[PDB]
Design a protein around this motif. Structure first.
Motif, PDB file in Angstrom:
ATOM      1  N   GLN A  26       0.979  -1.181   0.017  1.00  0.00           N
ATOM      2  CA  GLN A  26      -0.024   0.032   0.156  1.00  0.00           C
ATOM      3  C   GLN A  26       0.927   1.281   0.057  1.00  0.00           C
ATOM      4  O   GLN A  26       1.921   1.290   0.827  1.00  0.00           O
ATOM      5  CB  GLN A  26      -0.870   0.117   1.254  1.00  0.00           C
ATOM      6  CG  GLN A  26      -1.933   1.251   1.190  1.00  0.00           C
ATOM      7  CD  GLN A  26      -1.286   2.382   2.168  1.00  0.00           C
ATOM      8  OE1 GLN A  26      -0.147   2.155   2.735  1.00  0.00           O
ATOM      9  NE2 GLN A  26      -2.140   3.535   2.064  1.00  0.00           N
ATOM     10  N   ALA A  28       0.995   5.053   1.246  1.00  0.00           N
ATOM     11  CA  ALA A  28       0.527   5.930   2.129  1.00  0.00           C
ATOM     12  C   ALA A  28       0.888   7.304   1.578  1.00  0.00           C
ATOM     13  O   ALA A  28       2.167   7.632   1.255  1.00  0.00           O
ATOM     14  CB  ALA A  28       0.466   5.511   3.167  1.00  0.00           C
ATOM     15  N   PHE A  42       3.966   1.526   2.042  1.00  0.00           N
ATOM     16  CA  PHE A  42       3.983   0.327   3.150  1.00  0.00           C
ATOM     17  C   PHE A  42       3.564  -0.832   2.765  1.00  0.00           C
ATOM     18  O   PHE A  42       3.664  -1.023   1.417  1.00  0.00           O
ATOM     19  CB  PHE A  42       2.637   1.142   4.244  1.00  0.00           C
ATOM     20  CG  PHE A  42       3.114   1.645   5.393  1.00  0.00           C
ATOM     21  CD1 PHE A  42       3.935   0.930   6.438  1.00  0.00           C
ATOM     22  CD2 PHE A  42       2.839   3.021   5.641  1.00  0.00           C
ATOM     23  CE1 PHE A  42       4.298   1.756   7.674  1.00  0.00           C
ATOM     24  CE2 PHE A  42       3.278   3.670   6.888  1.00  0.00           C
ATOM     25  CZ  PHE A  42       3.833   3.239   7.941  1.00  0.00           C
ATOM     26  N   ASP A  44       0.674  -3.557   1.951  1.00  0.00           N
ATOM     27  CA  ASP A  44      -0.881  -3.679   1.993  1.00  0.00           C
ATOM     28  C   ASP A  44      -1.461  -4.319   3.226  1.00  0.00           C
ATOM     29  O   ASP A  44      -2.491  -3.513   3.587  1.00  0.00           O
ATOM     30  CB  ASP A  44      -1.198  -4.563   0.822  1.00  0.00           C
ATOM     31  CG  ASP A  44      -1.437  -3.773  -0.518  1.00  0.00           C
ATOM     32  OD1 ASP A  44      -2.173  -2.736  -0.570  1.00  0.00           O
ATOM     33  OD2 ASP A  44      -0.927  -4.305  -1.781  1.00  0.00           O
ATOM     34  N   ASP A  45      -1.106  -5.211   3.778  1.00  0.00           N
ATOM     35  CA  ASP A  45      -1.421  -5.535   5.188  1.00  0.00           C
ATOM     36  C   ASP A  45      -0.332  -4.666   6.313  1.00  0.00           C
ATOM     37  O   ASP A  45       0.476  -5.159   6.842  1.00  0.00           O
ATOM     38  CB  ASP A  45      -1.026  -6.902   5.471  1.00  0.00           C
ATOM     39  CG  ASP A  45      -1.505  -7.489   6.891  1.00  0.00           C
ATOM     40  OD1 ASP A  45      -2.407  -6.526   7.480  1.00  0.00           O
ATOM     41  OD2 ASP A  45      -1.100  -8.357   7.264  1.00  0.00           O
ATOM     42  N   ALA A  46      -0.967  -3.299   6.475  1.00  0.00           N
ATOM     43  CA  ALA A  46      -0.076  -2.536   7.155  1.00  0.00           C
ATOM     44  C   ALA A  46      -1.154  -1.467   7.768  1.00  0.00           C
ATOM     45  O   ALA A  46      -1.964  -0.822   7.120  1.00  0.00           O
ATOM     46  CB  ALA A  46       1.076  -1.767   6.491  1.00  0.00           C
ATOM     47  N   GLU A  47      -1.004  -1.209   9.285  1.00  0.00           N
ATOM     48  CA  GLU A  47      -1.611  -0.239   9.880  1.00  0.00           C
ATOM     49  C   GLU A  47      -1.205   1.222   9.413  1.00  0.00           C
ATOM     50  O   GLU A  47       0.280   1.434   9.209  1.00  0.00           O
ATOM     51  CB  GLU A  47      -1.760  -0.251  11.230  1.00  0.00           C
ATOM     52  CG  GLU A  47      -2.823   0.506  11.918  1.00  0.00           C
ATOM     53  CD  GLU A  47      -2.522   2.041  12.234  1.00  0.00           C
ATOM     54  OE1 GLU A  47      -1.391   2.227  12.362  1.00  0.00           O
ATOM     55  OE2 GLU A  47      -3.552   2.762  12.628  1.00  0.00           O
ATOM     56  N   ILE A  48      -1.927   2.232   8.974  1.00  0.00           N
ATOM     57  CA  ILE A  48      -1.456   3.614   8.771  1.00  0.00           C
ATOM     58  C   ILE A  48      -1.636   4.568   9.790  1.00  0.00           C
ATOM     59  O   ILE A  48      -2.771   4.957  10.095  1.00  0.00           O
ATOM     60  CB  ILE A  48      -2.102   3.991   7.413  1.00  0.00           C
ATOM     61  CG1 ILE A  48      -2.233   2.849   6.521  1.00  0.00           C
ATOM     62  CG2 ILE A  48      -1.449   5.254   6.804  1.00  0.00           C
ATOM     63  CD1 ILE A  48      -3.633   2.465   6.251  1.00  0.00           C
ATOM     64  N   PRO A  49      -0.731   5.000  10.595  1.00  0.00           N
ATOM     65  CA  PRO A  49      -1.046   5.979  11.723  1.00  0.00           C
ATOM     66  C   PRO A  49      -1.184   7.189  10.732  1.00  0.00           C
ATOM     67  O   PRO A  49      -0.792   7.478   9.772  1.00  0.00           O
ATOM     68  CB  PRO A  49       0.487   5.961  12.285  1.00  0.00           C
ATOM     69  CG  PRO A  49       1.374   5.466  11.444  1.00  0.00           C
ATOM     70  CD  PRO A  49       0.777   4.550  10.559  1.00  0.00           C
ATOM     71  N   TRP A  52       3.595  10.897  10.858  1.00  0.00           N
ATOM     72  CA  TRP A  52       4.746  10.207  10.365  1.00  0.00           C
ATOM     73  C   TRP A  52       5.820  11.263  10.075  1.00  0.00           C
ATOM     74  O   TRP A  52       5.644  12.168   9.543  1.00  0.00           O
ATOM     75  CB  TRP A  52       4.362   9.374   9.017  1.00  0.00           C
ATOM     76  CG  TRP A  52       5.789   8.488   8.594  1.00  0.00           C
ATOM     77  CD1 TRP A  52       6.536   8.717   7.317  1.00  0.00           C
ATOM     78  CD2 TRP A  52       6.401   7.612   9.388  1.00  0.00           C
ATOM     79  NE1 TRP A  52       7.358   7.849   7.334  1.00  0.00           N
ATOM     80  CE2 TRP A  52       7.290   7.298   8.317  1.00  0.00           C
ATOM     81  CE3 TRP A  52       6.121   6.914  10.459  1.00  0.00           C
ATOM     82  CZ2 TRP A  52       8.138   6.079   8.929  1.00  0.00           C
ATOM     83  CZ3 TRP A  52       6.874   5.716  10.756  1.00  0.00           C
ATOM     84  CH2 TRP A  52       7.990   5.353   9.925  1.00  0.00           C
TER      85      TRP A  52
END
Lengths: 109, 74
Positions: A26, A28, A42, A44-49, A52
């Motif tokens: 993904q 971002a 990031f 694709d299986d990643a939390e986006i804070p 940054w």
DNA sequence: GGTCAGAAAATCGGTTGTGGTCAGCTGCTGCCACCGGTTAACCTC
């Protein structure tokens, strides 16, 4: 005479640089205060804070308005507050009014 | 590098079902191994049948007739 | 003096089952790093 050994703190692998079956990514996007996009690829299986750090100098926030939380920032040690922790209101106001009376009698005459 | 190429050749000396079974078992195609029932799900049979095929294939690879080229790569 | 029919293999494949074992997860257990308050040591108001 003097021959030594040594290595930097790090190990080296040996793989093949395939460029097709990578992990799913993904991309971002963040943004600083001064309109500076910083595209962050990031997983694709990643939390986006929502925030940054970027090369711009500050913690650039998300380009979304989904997480706009500005809450937890305050100066914990102001000179006025640490004056208040040792000096009372009536004593400080008495000193203030005495210096105001002195400067009124000085400037006025 | 020669070990990787010889491994690819010997892995392709056997048939495709057990070949992809070993590849998914050890992550030789992606870098990520799978569970036995995961491989059974993506193939189409049960995981115990998968385990039987895997064990006998591992024995076939262990056999000297295919271990000739990998006898002394250690 | 042919003739389906049964018994009994093996073979790929489910199944169940079950047992255990371990990855890990995580709230106590307890120790370990700053923080600063206090307590006997130096210079002479």
């Amino acid at each position: 005479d003097r021959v030594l050994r040594g290595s930097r703190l790090g190990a080296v692998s040996y793989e093949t640089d395939r460029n097709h079956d990578l992990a799913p990514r993904q991309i971002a996007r963040y943004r600083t205060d001064n309109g500076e996009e910083f595209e962050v690829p990031f997983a694709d299986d990643a939390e986006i804070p929502g925030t940054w750090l970027c090369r711009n100098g500050m913690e650039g926030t998300l380009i979304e308005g989904d997480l706009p939380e500005p809450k937890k920032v305050k100066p914990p040690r102001t000179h006025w507050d640490m004056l208040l922790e040792r000096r009372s209101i009536e004593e400080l106001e008495e000193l203030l009014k005495e210096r105001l009376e002195l400067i009124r009698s000085r400037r006025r005459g | 590098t020669l070990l990787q190429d010889q491994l690819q050749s010997v892995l392709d000396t056997l048939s495709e079902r057990e070949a992809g079974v070993v590849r998914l078992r050890f992550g030789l195609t992606d870098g990520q191994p799978r569970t036995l029932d995961e491989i059974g799900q993506v193939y189409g049979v049960t995981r115990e049948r998968i385990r039987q095929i895997e064990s006998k294939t591992m024995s076939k690879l262990r056999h000297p007739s295919r271990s000739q080229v990998l006898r002394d790569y250690l």
